Design an enzyme around this catalytic site. Sequence first.
Site, mmCIF file in Angstrom:
data_model
loop_
_atom_site.group_PDB
_atom_site.id
_atom_site.type_symbol
_atom_site.label_atom_id
_atom_site.label_comp_id
_atom_site.label_asym_id
_atom_site.label_seq_id
_atom_site.Cartn_x
_atom_site.Cartn_y
_atom_site.Cartn_z
ATOM 1 N N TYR A 179 0.848 -1.155 0.000
ATOM 2 C CA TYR A 179 0.000 0.000 0.000
ATOM 3 C C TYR A 179 0.911 1.240 0.000
ATOM 4 O O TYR A 179 0.867 2.050 0.924
ATOM 5 C CB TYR A 179 -0.887 -0.065 1.250
ATOM 6 C CG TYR A 179 -2.115 0.779 1.182
ATOM 7 C CD1 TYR A 179 -2.858 1.039 2.321
ATOM 8 C CD2 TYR A 179 -2.523 1.342 -0.012
ATOM 9 C CE1 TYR A 179 -3.997 1.831 2.266
ATOM 10 C CE2 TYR A 179 -3.653 2.142 -0.080
ATOM 11 C CZ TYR A 179 -4.389 2.381 1.059
ATOM 12 O OH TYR A 179 -5.525 3.175 0.986
ATOM 13 N N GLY A 234 6.525 0.983 10.652
ATOM 14 C CA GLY A 234 5.364 0.778 9.772
ATOM 15 C C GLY A 234 5.630 -0.294 8.713
ATOM 16 O O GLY A 234 5.850 0.017 7.527
ATOM 17 N N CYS A 235 5.581 -1.560 9.118
ATOM 18 C CA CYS A 235 6.185 -2.624 8.330
ATOM 19 C C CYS A 235 5.215 -3.377 7.414
ATOM 20 O O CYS A 235 5.618 -4.337 6.721
ATOM 21 C CB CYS A 235 6.923 -3.589 9.249
ATOM 22 S SG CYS A 235 5.855 -4.528 10.350
ATOM 23 N N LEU A 250 0.849 -0.864 13.917
ATOM 24 C CA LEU A 250 -0.292 -0.693 14.817
ATOM 25 C C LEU A 250 -1.525 -1.495 14.360
ATOM 26 O O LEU A 250 -2.649 -1.192 14.787
ATOM 27 C CB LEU A 250 -0.627 0.805 14.989
ATOM 28 C CG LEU A 250 0.496 1.678 15.589
ATOM 29 C CD1 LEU A 250 0.149 3.161 15.541
ATOM 30 C CD2 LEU A 250 0.829 1.234 17.028
ATOM 31 N N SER A 251 -1.308 -2.522 13.524
ATOM 32 C CA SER A 251 -2.386 -3.361 12.975
ATOM 33 C C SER A 251 -2.202 -4.864 13.230
ATOM 34 O O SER A 251 -1.212 -5.450 12.782
ATOM 35 C CB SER A 251 -2.515 -3.082 11.473
ATOM 36 O OG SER A 251 -3.033 -4.202 10.765
ATOM 37 N N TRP A 257 6.544 3.524 17.232
ATOM 38 C CA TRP A 257 7.938 3.869 17.421
ATOM 39 C C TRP A 257 8.117 4.599 18.738
ATOM 40 O O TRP A 257 9.189 4.582 19.304
ATOM 41 C CB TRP A 257 8.456 4.720 16.275
ATOM 42 C CG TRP A 257 7.724 6.031 16.113
ATOM 43 C CD1 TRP A 257 6.705 6.309 15.240
ATOM 44 C CD2 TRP A 257 7.963 7.234 16.844
ATOM 45 N NE1 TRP A 257 6.297 7.607 15.390
ATOM 46 C CE2 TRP A 257 7.047 8.199 16.369
ATOM 47 C CE3 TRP A 257 8.869 7.592 17.863
ATOM 48 C CZ2 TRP A 257 7.010 9.517 16.862
ATOM 49 C CZ3 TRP A 257 8.824 8.897 18.369
ATOM 50 C CH2 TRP A 257 7.894 9.845 17.861
ATOM 51 N N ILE A 310 8.471 3.332 5.174
ATOM 52 C CA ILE A 310 7.819 3.638 3.894
ATOM 53 C C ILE A 310 6.355 4.005 4.171
ATOM 54 O O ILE A 310 5.529 3.145 4.547
ATOM 55 C CB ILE A 310 7.912 2.436 2.917
ATOM 56 C CG1 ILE A 310 9.374 2.001 2.722
ATOM 57 C CG2 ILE A 310 7.310 2.765 1.491
ATOM 58 C CD1 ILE A 310 9.496 0.585 2.051
ATOM 59 N N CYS A 327 -5.818 11.953 -6.128
ATOM 60 C CA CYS A 327 -4.368 11.975 -5.908
ATOM 61 C C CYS A 327 -3.576 11.948 -7.218
ATOM 62 O O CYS A 327 -2.624 12.719 -7.377
ATOM 63 C CB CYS A 327 -3.916 10.815 -4.993
ATOM 64 S SG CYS A 327 -4.606 10.847 -3.307
#
Length: 270
Positions: A16, A55-56, A78-79, A106, A119, A248
């Site tokens: 994503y 954020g992996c 956080l998921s 973090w 990323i 976007c």
Amino acid sequence: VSDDFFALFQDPTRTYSCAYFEPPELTLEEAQYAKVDLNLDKLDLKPGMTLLDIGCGWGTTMRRAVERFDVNVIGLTLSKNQHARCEQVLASIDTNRSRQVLLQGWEDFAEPVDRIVSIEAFEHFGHENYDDFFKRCFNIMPADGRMTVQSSVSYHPYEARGKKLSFETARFIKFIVTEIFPGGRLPSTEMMVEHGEKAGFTVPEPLSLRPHYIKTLRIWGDTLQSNKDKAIEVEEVYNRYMKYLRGCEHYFTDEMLDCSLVTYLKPGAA
Ligand SMILES: CCCCCCCCCCNCCSC[C@H]1O[C@@H](n2cnc3c(N)ncnc32)[C@H](O)[C@@H]1O
């Protein structure tokens, strides 16, 4: 937002984030691996090091790092969705390197690591927390540490393209940060660079990923468009994301949004 939904517009990897079409003729999927290599190749990763992925996601960056560089890895997300996937993704690798994924931000991470990749998580941090973020990243790394942060950006309300376009863009952005990524907030490139400098990082010239995000949003838009039906039964949500994707692409085309890959070098980097 269900996993099955994103499944109907993203490549098989479920990345994503902005893909990297180098060479230009790569699949979306190939382009997502190439974007991963683009980040990691900047990091001076040597075997035995520990790489922190902040954020992996679904664990794609970390897997490629273990395989390509023979490193240990730690991932923050956080998921719960993402955490269990990552865990099975990591456990599946043929390696004796340690691999760990933590359900936490973090802000609560304070372990020594060698290198950091992040990323498109940075848009969730909040302007208010940029100083702490960069200080934490400087402090957890050795003398030769390096970090990449990739992030969509906008421009300070001052930074000319016409009154009409600038009011319009501010609104569309409100809508992203409200109904697509609640609580989000876009930095500018200048903020990304400056907060890193203030923590004591050397910051080379950032890489713009603009035409690559344009190319990414088009394939996303086009793939979701072709599942108009299949996606509705899993109308409201559909039209929302179509507004997001087409919007976007438009504002990236118009050069009202950008996407920056910024590299941060500690004084003792190589
Ligand atoms: C082109 C669009 C225009 C710009 C719109 C705003 C960009 C929205 C970001 C979309 N990029 C998606 C990459 S996935 C985000 C990852 O970061 C994680 N994350 C968020 N905050 C933190 C955090 N504080 N600590 C650790 N991980 C975090 C999430 O769990 C997740 O795995």
